[PDB]
Amino acid sequence: GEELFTGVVPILVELDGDVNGHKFSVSGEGEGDATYGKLTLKFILTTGKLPVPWPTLVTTLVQCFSRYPDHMKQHDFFKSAMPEGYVQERTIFFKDDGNYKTRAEVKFEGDTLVNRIELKGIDFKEDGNILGHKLEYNYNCHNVYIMADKQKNGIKVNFKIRHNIEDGSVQLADHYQQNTPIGDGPVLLPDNHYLSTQSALSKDPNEKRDHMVLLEFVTAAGI
């Protein structure tokens, strides 16, 4: 698994979502440098209207591209799971608003690491922060504490996101995630540790379409 990320690995992201009955589809393209922990990615609205601000979809739209220093390479579940992949299942709640429920399967189609997603979002208020587009186009460093689940030969990941709002307030969003290998073969089940995470949103000055340009850095530590 580790040996498949030695390089700059191309990457594709297909998203299908359905927020309060608002169907859409997104389509990301970019590479990933596991060595540098580094993601570069253009996103693209392919079908329909976007009922949600992009920062909401960030954590949803490849933890196998996290940098693991040599002394906890024996903790890198995401990459051992390869090339057959893993299932990443999340529910995100939004304090005093709705929630997303998220299934996705991540794996190589040949040389291309593919991330294909179902999303479904319910009980968002027509005049709330989310559907109202009340969110500062930005993103803050976050930590992702990763504990094991021998029970389901997988991992369990608690973290929260502080979405900046236009007012000055914050729209927190509690993430409950569990990752399980698609194949049947042995994986590395880490000791307790986190991933320090950095996301920078931007725009293509030459893209008429509704898109996101995203530079990420994910390094591990803690151990």
Q: For residue 138, give the CATH number of its domain.
A: 2.40.155.10
Residues 41, 9 contacting (CB under 8 angstroms): no
Closest CA to 146 of 97, 195, 181: 195
Q: How far apart are CA 80 and CA 29, in angstroms?
A: 23
Q: How far apart are the first and last CA of the chain?
A: 22
Resolution in A: 3.0
Exposure on the CB side of residue 141, measured as CA atoms within 13 A: 6
Bond into 69 cis (ω within 30): no
> Domain range for residue 45?
2-221
φ, ψ of residue 152 to 5 degrees: the values are -115, 30
Strand, helix or coil at 155?
strand
Q: How far apart are CA 159 and CA 126, in angstroms?
A: 26
Q: How many domains does the chain have?
A: 1
Experimental method: X-ray
- E strand or H helix that includes residue 27: strand 22-33
